[PDB]
Design a protein. Structure first.
Length: 452
C-alpha cells in the first residue's frame, strides 16, 4: 500500500508539501504516496486566492503549479471540510499515516488600545478578506465614505490596503476584486490614507517593488515629509541590507516630490496609535511620537515620547500582522500564534506536522513556503521509514473508507471536479467584463454552484 497523508489546508505550504511527498515517491523505490487535502473553504489556494491583492494578478499564476499537482491520480481534494468542526485532528491521526497542518494564520494581531473595537476600526485580515471575497468576511462591510483612513503598520499588507482604498475604481473594476468592495469603492470617499509606522524607515518590512508601484496609482500622490528621513542615512540603510538600501532610495524619491487636488497616501514613521475615539464609531485617532532606542537584543525598538496628537479619521485598519488560531486537539503557542514543533513535527505527536505560516509565523512571500515544506516532508518521510522498519505502521480500499467517512461528516464537501465548476463559473463571469473572474463571495453561493 501507499502511505496515506492528509494535508489540512490548500494554500502554498500545503501544495508544496504535496509536491514534495509525491516527488519522494516518484524518486524512491518501495515508497508510494496517496495525498488527501482537506480545505475549510470550497476553494483551494489559500491566500494566493484570498490574500494577494486583486491588482497583483501576476503572482497568482503560481496556482497553475498547484493545479498540476492536483492532476496527479494519487491526490484528492475535499473542500468545505473544516478540521476542528467536521473532523478532528485525533480522527485524522487514526486514519492517515501522517497529517500535515498547513492552516496558515486565520486571524489578526491586535493593537490592544482603547477604542479598537469601535465600528470603523478593523484589521487588515478582515478588510482584505472582504475585498477578496473570502466567505468568512462577506459582512465586514466597512464604511468607506469618510475622507481619511489610517492604516497602522509598515509591512506590504499595509500597502495593499492603502492601494485598494485609493486606486481609481475604474481600474479596480477590471480586477477580480469582490463586487461588494468595488461597489463601496466607486464613490471615491477616501481622499487620504495615512500609513503609520511605529519604528523608522530602516525598520520597515516593505519590499521595494511594492513601494515603487505606488508611483503608478493614477490620481494619487505619495506624500512623505522630508523630515521623515532626517537621521535616516544611506550608510545605515546599506547596513540593514540590500532591500533596505533600495527602499530608502525609493522613499527619498517620493519625499523629493512636492499638490492640491489629488488623493494622498501619506507615510508617517516613528508614530504609534494610542487610542481610537468617537461616538459610536471611529471619528479620530490619538497618535504618539516614538524615538528609536537600542534594547540590548541587537535591534532598535520604539520608545514612546509621551507626546500626543489627535487626527480626524473615519476608518482605521490595523495591518500589524496576521495571527494563527488554535486548532482543537493540537498544541499552540499563544504568544506567537504558532504550533510548537521541531523540524516540522508537532510537539508531542509521532505523526502530525506543520508547514507554512502556522509553523513559522506569518511572514514571507509565497516561495518561502517551499523549502519549509520540503524540510517538514523530509522529516515526516524519515519518521515513516523508521516506523515501517520497526513494524510500527498502521495497518490499513482504505482510500474509499476515508472518503466515505468525510462524506458522512460533511455531506456538502467539494471535490476537485466541483471546485473546477466553481472556477469555471467565476472565470466565465469575469472575462466578458475584462476581469480574470468574479468571485462567489458567500458559502451559500459557492455551494449553489459547487454541489450542483
Ligand atoms: C494580504 C496578503 C497578501 C499577500 N500578497 C503576497 C504577494 O503579493 N506575493 C507573495 O509572494 N506573497 C504574498 N503574501 C504571502 C503569502 O500569502 C503567504 O506566504 C502564503 O499564502 C502562506 O501560505 P500558507 O500555506 O502557510 O497559508 P495560507 O495561504 O493562509 O493557506 C492556509 C489554508 O488553510 C486553510 N485552513 C485554515 N484552517 C483550516 C482548518 N481548520 N481546516 C481546513 N482548512 C483550514 C485556509 O482556508 C487556507 O486555504 C501575501 C499575504 C497576505 C496576508
Ligand atoms: N508583494 C509581496 O511580496 C507581498 C508580500 N506579503 C508578505 O506577507 C507577509 C505578511 O505581511 P504583513 O504586512 O501582514 O506583516 P509584516 O511584513 O510582518 O509587517 C507587520 C508590520 O506591523 C508592524 N507592527 C506590529 N505590531 C505593531 C503595533 N502594535 N503597532 C504598530 N505597528 C506594529 C510591524 O512593525 P515592527 O517591525 O514590528 O516594528 C510591521 O511594520 C510579509 O512577509 C509580507 O512581505 C504581503 C503582501 C504583498 O504584497
Amino acid at each position: 500500500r501507499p502511505y496515506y497523508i492528509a494535508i489540512v489546508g490548500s494554500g502554498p505550504s500545503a501544495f508544496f508539501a504535496a509536491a514534495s511527498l509525491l516527488k519522494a515517491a516518484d524518486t524512491t523505490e518501495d515508497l508510494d504516496m496517496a495525498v488527501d487535502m482537506l480545505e475549510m473553504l470550497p476553494t483551494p489556494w489559500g491566500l494566493v486566492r484570498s490574500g494577494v491583492a486583486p491588482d497583483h494578478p501576476k503572482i497568482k499564476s503560481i496556482s497553475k503549479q498547484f493545479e498540476k499537482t492536483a492532476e496527479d491520480p494519487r491526490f484528492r481534494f475535499f473542500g468545505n471540510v473544516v478540521v476542528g468542526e467536521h473532523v478532528q485532528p485525533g480522527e485524522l491521526s487514526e486514519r492517515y499515516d501522517a497529517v500535515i497542518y498547513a492552516v496558515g494564520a486565520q486571524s489578526d494581531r491586535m493593537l490592544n488600545i482603547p477604542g479598537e473595537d469601535l465600528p470603523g476600526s478593523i484589521a487588515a485580515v478582515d478588510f482584505v478578506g472582504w475585498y477578496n471575497a473570502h466567505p468568512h468576511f462577506e459582512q465586514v462591510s466597512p464604511d468607506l465614505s469618510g475622507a481619511r483612513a489610517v492604516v497602522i503598520g509598515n509591512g506590504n499588507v499595509a500597502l495593499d490596503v492603502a492601494r485598494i482604498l485609493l486606486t481609481d475604481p475604474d481600474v479596480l473594476a477590471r480586477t477580480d476584486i469582490a463586487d461588494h468592495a468595488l461597489e463601496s469603492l466607486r464613490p471615491r470617499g477616501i481622499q487620504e490614507v495615512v500609513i503609520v509606522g511605529r519604528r523608522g524607515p530602516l525598520q520597515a518590512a516593505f519590499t521595494t517593488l511594492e513601494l515603487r508601484e505606488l508611483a503608478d496609482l493614477d490620481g494619487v500622490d505619495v506624500v512623505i515629509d522630508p523630515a521623515e528621513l532626517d537621521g535616516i542615512t544611506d550608510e545605515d540603510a546599506a547596513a540593514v541590507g540590500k532591500v533596505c538600501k533600495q527602499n530608502i532610495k525609493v522613499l527619498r524619491g517620493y519625499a523629493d516630490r512636492e499638490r492640491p487636488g489629488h488623493r494622498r497616501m501619506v507615510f508617517r514613521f516613528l508614530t504609534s496609535p494610542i487610542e481610537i475615539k468617537g461616538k459610536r464609531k471611529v471619528e479620530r485617532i490619538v497618535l504618539g511620537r516614538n524615538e528609536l532606542v537600542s534594547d540590548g537584543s541587537g535591534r532598535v525598538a520604539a520608545k514612546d515620547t509621551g507626546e500626543r496628537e489627535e487626527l480626524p479619521a473615519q476608518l482605521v485598519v490595523r495591518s500589524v500582522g496576521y495571527r494563527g488560531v488554535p486548532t482543537p486537539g493540537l498544541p499552540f503557542d499563544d504568544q506567537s500564534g504558532t504550533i510548537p514543533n521541531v523540524g516540522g513535527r508537532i510537539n508531542g505527536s509521532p505523526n502530525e506536522y506543520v508547514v507554512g505560516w502556522i509553523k513559522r509565523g506569518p511572514t514571507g512571500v509565497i516561495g518561502t513556503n517551499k523549502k519549509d515544506a520540503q524540510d517538514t516532508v523530509d522529516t515526516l518521510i524519515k519518521n515513516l521509514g523508521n516506523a515501517k522498519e520497526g513494524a510500527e505502521c498502521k495497518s490499513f480500499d482504505h482510500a474509499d473508507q476515508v472518503a466515505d467517512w468525510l462524506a458522512a461528516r460533511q455531506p456538502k464537501l467539494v471535490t476537485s471536479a466541483h471546485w473546477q465548476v466553481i472556477d469555471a463559473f467565476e472565470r466565465a463571469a469575469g472575462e466578458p467584463h475584462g476581469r480574470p473572474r468574479v468571485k462567489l463571495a458567500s458559502l451559500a453561493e459557492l455551494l449553489r454552484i459547487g454541489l450542483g
